[PDB]
């Protein structure tokens, strides 16, 4: 530890005030929205809600492309296949369901139901069209083969429930954050844990890779967001405000990695300059907890879902 | 007007999808969510089976072949007069001394959220049993923030039982701590609390040989009366209410009760009545 990150970026120009306005508002969910995932095309997005509905939406025109009825209304996570053919949903039923969007009878039907975990599914993220990695409240992360239907790898080092998962850009490493305040970097091919980080003092509810892939950020029930390097193997910064005392539901980066956007239980989202750790903007549209925050692959917009059942696109 | 021919067809699809969402929401709100909390009595999970027999649902031979292995597993688990000092199945004597009875008393832990739909008087409810979750409740308790009622099930014959795994801790004091912790939750501030007291018959026999005063010093009654013990226990539970304005509905269930559904309806109807009175500023 030669120096702190804030000492090196002391002589850098501040971002300045960030102003973002709702350019769209997606209405239709009738219950709390728990999860959202943008598509790779950067126009389509999927969102999951407790009324038992998974909805694919066109962002540009606010049009609803697809509406999928789920078997278990208790869903906590949502994912969109990088190709665009598939969506995955899971929740308190302990099953990860894969549905196909580009099927030839017009309807969206379930392709496979992956049932190996004993705890609730908290996150799932497609690795290819045939490989998905899921995190569970049973303290274990599993890498599956969608065609066969069997989990090829299990990551078991965690002691508390795993709440969030994030895949590296190269899709060879991922990081998981757990209820024991530890985040672990897991190698997907070997199946072991390369590193563990323990800077937080309460449950980690959110985790996200920096665009470079050599860093990541966590958000916890304690109000702080923490940035952790992978090569230095140490915490770099903490993003906290005396006024902020609520939990952090979701965290995500900007395309350049200069802005870190975090969704809070104070009903509003914050935008931090990730290199000076000083708050730069707010997103105050929602009137309930901001449950999901996702930025696009090109950085054009930021969608925020919430427990008031509306999604909002900001730019 | 600025839209193309295909853009207009896309908007027509988004309008049909909106119509279907609204119709689904209309269908959904006519259902009332009841959250059954998992205690040690609920962990045993025999009361739910017996109440199911009362509804009329039964077991085919296939289902009983399902429970064969569980029966044998239970004999071994129990084996591996002084029941109250340690943890033991309630039905060890009957086994050591499959029929429908054998099916009923196979104490089995449950994997995840199990939902029971039941319809009474044009009102349909869903009983969401969360007993077998076995994961941090701080991370999934919000899901049921908005529910009509949080049902609880505690046994009346639990006052003398001290479990071996605890270091001399009374099981009833454990159920009281759980009850207080749940009802103090800010998520359920708008939700009714229903409490069911079970094992009514087992108390009628247990009270004669076991004095409640020995385990709880406050009790001052006949010392051989089950009626006085029941009322004292219900008083201990109801006293935990931290509001004093919210009702805590109660019932004494004997495992042969055929009024557990009617009571749940009458408690839900009165929950709704009070919510209405509060919103119309009458109360």
């Amino acid at each position, epitope marked *: 530890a030669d120096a702190t990150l804030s000492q090196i970026t002391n002589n850098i120009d501040p971002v300045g005030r960030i102003q973002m306005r709702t350019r769209r508002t997606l209405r239709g969910h009738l219950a709390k929205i728990y999860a959202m995932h943008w598509g790779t095309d950067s126009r389509l997005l999927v969102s999951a809600s407790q009324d038992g509905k998974l909805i694919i939406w066109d962002s540009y*025109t606010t049009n609803k*492309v697809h509406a999928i009825p789920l078997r278990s209304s208790w869903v906590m996570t949502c994912a969109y296949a990088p190709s665009g053919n598939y969506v995955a949903c899971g929740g308190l039923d302990n099953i990860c369901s894969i549905y196909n969007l580009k099927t030839r*009878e*017009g309807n969206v039907r379930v392709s496979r139901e992956l049932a190996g975990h004993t705890g609730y599914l908290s996150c799932c993220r497609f690795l290819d069209d045939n490989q998905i990695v899921t995190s569970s409240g049973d303290t274990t992360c599993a890498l599956w083969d969608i065609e066969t239907g069997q989990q090829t790898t299990t990551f078991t080092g965690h002691t508390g429930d795993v709440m969030s998962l994030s895949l590296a850009p190269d899709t060879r490493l991922f990081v998981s954050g757990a209820c024991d305040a530890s985040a672990k970097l897991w190698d997907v091919r070997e199946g072991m844990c390369r590193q563990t980080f323990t800077g937080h003092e309460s449950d980690i509810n959110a985790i996200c890779f920096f665009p470079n892939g050599n860093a990541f950020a966590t958000g916890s029930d304690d109000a702080t967001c923490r940035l952790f390097d992978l090569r230095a193997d140490q915490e770099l910064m903490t993003y906290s405000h005396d006024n902020i005392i609520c939990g952090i539901t979701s965290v995500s980066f900007s395309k350049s990695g200069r802005l870190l956007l975090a969704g809070y239980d104070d009903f509003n989202c914050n935008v931090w300059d990730a290199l000076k750790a000083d708050r730069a903007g707010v997103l105050a549209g929602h009137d309930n907890r901001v449950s999901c925050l996702g930025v696009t692959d090109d950085g054009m917009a930021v969608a925020t879902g919430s427990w008031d059942s509306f999604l909002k696109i900001w730019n | 007007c600025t839209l193309s021919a295909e*853009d207009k067809a*896309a908007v*027509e*699809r988004s309008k*049909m999808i909106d119509r279907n969402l609204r119709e689904d929401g209309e269908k959904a709100r006519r259902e009332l969510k009841l959250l059954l909390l998992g205690t040690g009595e609920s962990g045993k999970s025999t009361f739910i089976k017996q109440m199911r027999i009362i509804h009329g649902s039964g077991y085919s031979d296939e289902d009983k072949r399902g429970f064969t292995k569980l029966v044998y597993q239970n004999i071994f688990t129990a084996m591996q007069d002084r029941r109250r000092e340690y943890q033991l199945s309630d039905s060890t004597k009957y086994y050591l001394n499959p029929t429908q009875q054998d099916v009923l008393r196979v104490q089995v832990p449950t994997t995840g959220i199990i939902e029971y739909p039941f319809d009474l008087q044009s009102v349909i409810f869903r009983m969401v049993d969360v007993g077998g979750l076995r994961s941090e409740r701080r991370k999934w308790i919000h899901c049921f923030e908005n529910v009509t009622s949080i049902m609880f099930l505690v046994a009346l014959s639990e006052y003398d039982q001290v479990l071996v795994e605890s270091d001399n801790e009374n099981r009833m004091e454990e159920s009281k701590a759980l009850f207080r912790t749940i009802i103090t939750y800010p998520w359920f501030q708008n939700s009714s609390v229903i409490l069911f007291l079970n094992k009514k018959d087992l108390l009628e026999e247990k009270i004669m040989y076991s004095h409640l005063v020995d385990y709880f010093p406050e009790y001052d009654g006949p010392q051989r009366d089950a009626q006085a013990a029941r009322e004292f226990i219900l008083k201990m539970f109801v006293d935990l209410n931290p509001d004093s304005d919210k009702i805590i509905y109660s019932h004494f269930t004997c495992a042969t009760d055929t009024e557990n559904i009617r009571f749940v309806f009458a408690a839900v109807k009165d929950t709704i009545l009070q919510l209405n009175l509060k919103e119309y500023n009458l109360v």
Partner: single-chain antibody
Amino acid sequence: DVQLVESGGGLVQPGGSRKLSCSASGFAFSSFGMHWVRQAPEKGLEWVAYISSGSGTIYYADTVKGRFTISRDDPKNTLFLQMTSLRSEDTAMYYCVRSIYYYGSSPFDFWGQGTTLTVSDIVMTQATSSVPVTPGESVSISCRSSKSLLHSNGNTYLYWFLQRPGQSPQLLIYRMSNLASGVPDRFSGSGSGTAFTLTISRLEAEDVGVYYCMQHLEYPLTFGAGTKLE
């Protein structure tokens, strides 16, 4: 899998009325809009009618508007086309065509076998009708439009179909570049606002047939004359 099988054609005395019907199988019929298209005995093919998903929208061809009626029994999975006051321009082969419209879909992807009926805006032009080419040589077909088919949304609404002798039309390319599912990567499409070109590299015997361009920017849905490869 997906089958549309129409029925109701035959020999009709002039001035009578006939009702056609396509029965659908193997797909979510209720979520598909439908078209009727018709082909003259020896000429190209022309759009006839379009009923929307949920029946909210109906468009008829100016030629038959007011004498034709289109209806769909979504529960029974059928599509009907009532025809009254049968003129002698109604001798044609009637093909049921399903199409679905959302961001990224491929309309006109499946066509039906067709029924024979015998009774006793934008113009799209292809200035060629016979190009005999040996297998193994690149073939470029051209098609021109009256106005720009490029909309403000950046989409150029030109579709390319193929008609094999004794077979129903089949979609090759939609919106000027995209390839339909199940077509070989040999077929490619590239066009300016008013001029469009379809190129078939490594020609094979299966490619021989009549190629039709079509527009979807406005609702006349005007096809082309067709370019034939022999």
